C-alpha cells in the first residue's frame, strides 16, 4: 500500500492579519526575486520529512497522541526574518524564526524523537531551529535575498507595531501529515 511521506508539526493559524502582512512582505521580496511563491499552509516542524510503511501510519499516530497528550499550550514569538535553503541548496525559503518559545519546541521535539526511534525513523536535525516558512523558490537565491532585502523585510516586520499575531502566538495542537492524511491532537 506504499510508503508514505510523514511529517510532524505544530500548525500555525494563518489569521487575516498575518496573511495581510504577507501581502506586503511577499511583493517586497519579489522585487528582488520575482519567482518566490507563497506557502499554502504554515507550521513549525517537529520532525524531518520521512517515509513510513502504510501499515505503521495509524500505530505511529497513536504513539504520537499518547506522548503529546501531556503537553500544554504555550506562547511563542516569531518575528525575526530568516533566509535559508534546503540541504542541497536547490530551494530557498523566507521564514520567521522562533525566538521566545524555542525551548518549548525543543521539549516537544524530544518526545517526537522518541516516537521516531520507535518506528526506526530519523530523529530531528542536530542543530534545530523553528521557523514559519512564508515563501520559497527554486535555486539558491541567498545572494539576492540576504543583505538589503532581508534588512528591509525585517524593518517591515519591526514596524508591525508588536502585533500579537507574531509576538504572542498561542499553540493549540500537534499534527502529523502522512501522505494526504492529517492527524491532529490537542495540547492541554
Ligand atoms: Cl526570479
Swiss-Prot record:
**Inhibition and activation profile:** 3'-5' RNA exonuclease activity is inhibited by a 3' phosphate terminated RNA.
Keyword annotations from UniProtKB, A to Z: Hydrolase, Lyase, Nuclease, Nucleus
Q: Which reaction does it catalyse?
A: a 3'-end uridylyl-uridine-RNA = a 3'-end 2',3'-cyclophospho-uridine-RNA + uridine; a 3'-end uridylyl-adenosine-RNA = a 3'-end 2',3'-cyclophospho-uridine-RNA + adenosine
Location of the protein in the cell: Nucleus
Q: Which GO biological process annotations does it have?
A: RNA splicing; snRNA 3'-end processing; U6 snRNA 3'-end processing
Taxonomic superkingdom: Eukaryota
Which residues of the sequence carry a binding annotation for AMP? 43-45, 125, 127-133
UniProt GO cellular component terms: intercellular bridge; nucleoplasm; nucleus
Variation of activity with pH:
Optimum pH is 7.5.
What Enzyme Commission number does this protein have?
A: 4.6.1.-
- The main place the protein resides is nucleus
Give the positions the UniProt entry annotates as the active site: 43 (proton acceptor), 131 (proton donor)
Claim: Transferase is one of the keywords in the record: no
Residue positions annotated to bind UMP are 87, 125, 129-133
The entry lists its GO molecular-function terms as: 3'-5'-RNA exonuclease activity; lyase activity; poly(U)-specific exoribonuclease activity, producing 3' uridine cyclic phosphate ends
Q: What class of enzyme is it?
A: lyase
Q: Which disease is it linked to?
A: Poikiloderma with neutropenia: A genodermatosis characterized by poikiloderma, pachyonychia and chronic neutropenia. The disorder starts as a papular erythematous rash on the limbs during the first year of life. It gradually spreads centripetally and, as the papular rash resolves, hypo- and hyperpigmentation result, with development of telangiectasias. Another skin manifestation is pachyonychia, but alopecia and leukoplakia are distinctively absent. Patients have recurrent pneumonias that usually result in reactive airway disease and/or chronic cough.
The record's function comment reads: 3'-5' RNA exonuclease that trims the 3' end of oligo(U) and oligo(A) tracts of the pre-U6 small nuclear RNA (snRNA) molecule, leading to the formation of a mature U6 snRNA 3' end-terminated with a 2',3'-cyclic phosphate. Participates in the U6 snRNA 3' end processing that prevents U6 snRNA degradation. In addition also removes uridines from the 3' end of U6atac snRNA and possibly the vault RNA VTRNA1-1.
Q: What family name appears in the similarity comment? A: Belongs to the 2H phosphoesterase superfamily. USB1 family.
Describe its partners and assembly state: Interacts with PLRG1, CDC5L and PRPF19.
List the protein's name.
U6 snRNA phosphodiesterase 1
Gene that this sequence comes from = USB1
Amino acid at each position: 500500500m506504499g510508503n508514505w511521506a510523514t511529517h510532524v508539526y505544530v500548525p500555525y493559524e494563518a489569521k487575516e492579519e498575518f496573511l495581510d502582512l504577507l501581502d506586503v512582505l511577499l511583493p517586497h521580496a519579489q522585487t528582488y526575486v520575482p519567482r518566490l511563491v507563497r506557502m499554502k499552509v504554515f507550521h513549525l516542524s517537529l520532525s524531518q520529512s520521512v517515509v513510513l510503511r502504510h501499515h505503521w501510519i495509524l500505530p505511529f499516530v497513536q504513539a504520537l497522541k499518547a506522548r503529546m497528550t501531556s503537553f500544554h499550550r504555550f506562547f511563542f514569538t516569531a518575528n525575526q526574518v530568516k533566509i535559508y535553503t534546503n540541504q542541497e541548496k536547490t530551494r530557498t525559503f523566507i521564514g520567521l524564526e522562533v525566538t521566545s518559545g524555542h525551548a518549548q519546541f525543543l521539549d516537544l521535539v524530544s518526545e517526537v524523537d522518541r516516537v521516531m526511534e520507535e518506528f526506526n525513523l530519523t530523529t530531528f536535525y542536530q542543530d534545530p531551529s523553528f521557523q514559519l516558512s512564508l515563501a520559497w523558490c527554486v535555486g539558491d537565491a541567498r545572494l539576492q535575498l540576504e543583505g538589503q532585502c532581508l534588512q528591509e523585510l525585517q524593518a517591515i516586520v519591526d514596524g508591525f507595531e508588536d502585533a500579537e499575531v507574531l509576538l504572542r502566538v498561542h499553540t493549540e495542537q500537534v499534527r502529523c501529515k502522512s501522505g494526504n492524511k492529517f492527524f491532529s491532537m490537542p495540547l492541554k
